[PDB]
Ligand binder design. Structure first.
Ligand SMILES: CCCCCCc1ccccc1CCCCC(=O)N[C@H](CO)COP(=O)(O)O
Length: 266
């Protein structure tokens, strides 16, 4: 029993979500903060890629740093397009277009997370251009397939009853998958960096950015998929902004230590 016939209104009304036909103080506030964060991400990551390409000094570690910067740039673009599509604007959507929006978000953040794990793995190995391009194509292939799987097959077009409260169309199975994927990625980063340490400031801030910008989102998604009657829609719009603020901080987290890169920035 599968229904692509209904519009977004049917799916929201099925769920607990609110369409927000009219503009709001909260809607204007989140639009302003989101556009600010997106402008910051785009500018900062454009600067990082320009530097990593202008200097022959940063010609594999800096390739993975620039790949992380490009994924964060894509996250900025995805979040920028998600804005100018919220509040009353969401009411103008269709199933295909809304899936476009959420798929861009999925692939962008998955690419950012995979680049963080790849930089951790390279740092572990360090402690030609073959392994670096192999891991870049693995990161991008995994990001695209992860952002496309719900857009094709893995969503609640067919089970209205069994899917999420926040994403009315993604399923509890997909949200559990994404969140456990991110959780195991974070524990792999923690074990790699702890083994490396066994420097403390760099490790703590690198893990801390990730924990304070993801644990909110991941615990929120697990609550949505596990606990009924846990009012979890309330703190969604700001937790996504925190997840994008992670990609905002990544360019200065992974470029502050390099005095050469600091001198480069011009
Ligand atoms: C697609 C799932 C990927 C995995 C989770 C991503 C994530 C992380 C941290 C906070 C939130 C999320 C997504 C939550 C839904 C996406 C959205 O845009 N929600 C907002 C919540 O107010 C409504 O968007 P809209 O209804 O205004 O279009």
């Amino acid at each position: 029993q599968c229904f692509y016939n209904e519009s977004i209104a049917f799916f929201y009304n099925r769920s607990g979500k609110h369409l927000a036909t009219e503009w709001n103080t909260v809607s204007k506030l989140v639009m302003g903060l989101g556009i600010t964060v997106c402008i910051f991400i785009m500018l900062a990551n454009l600067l990082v890629m320009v530097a990593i390409y202008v200097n022959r000094r940063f010609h594999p570690i800096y390739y993975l740093m620039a790949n992380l910067a490009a994924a964060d740039f894509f996250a900025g673009l995805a979040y920028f397009y998600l804005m100018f599509n919220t509040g009353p604007n969401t009411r103008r959507l269709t199933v295909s277009t809304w899936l476009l929006r959420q798929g861009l978000i999925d692939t962008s953040l998955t690419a950012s997370v995979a680049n963080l794990l790849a930089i951790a793995i390279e740092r572990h190995i360090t402690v030609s251009n073959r392994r670096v391009v192999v891991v870049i194509v693995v990161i991008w292939t995994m990001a695209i397939v992860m952002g496309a799987i719900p857009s094709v097959g893995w969503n609640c077009i067919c089970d209205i009853e069994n899917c999420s409260n926040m994403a009315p169309l993604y399923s509890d199975s997909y949200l559990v998958f994404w969140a456990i994927f991110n959780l195991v990625t974070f524990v792999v980063m923690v074990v790699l960096y702890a083994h490396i340490f066994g420097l403390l400031k760099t490790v703590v801030i690198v893990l801390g950015a990730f924990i304070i910008c993801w644990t909110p989102g991941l615990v929120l998604l697990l609550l949505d998929v596990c606990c009924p009657q846990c009012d979890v829609l309330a703190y969604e719009k700001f937790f996504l902004l925190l997840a994008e603020f992670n990609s905002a901080m990544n360019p200065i987290i992974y470029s502050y230590r390099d005095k050469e890169m600091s001198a480069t920035f011009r």
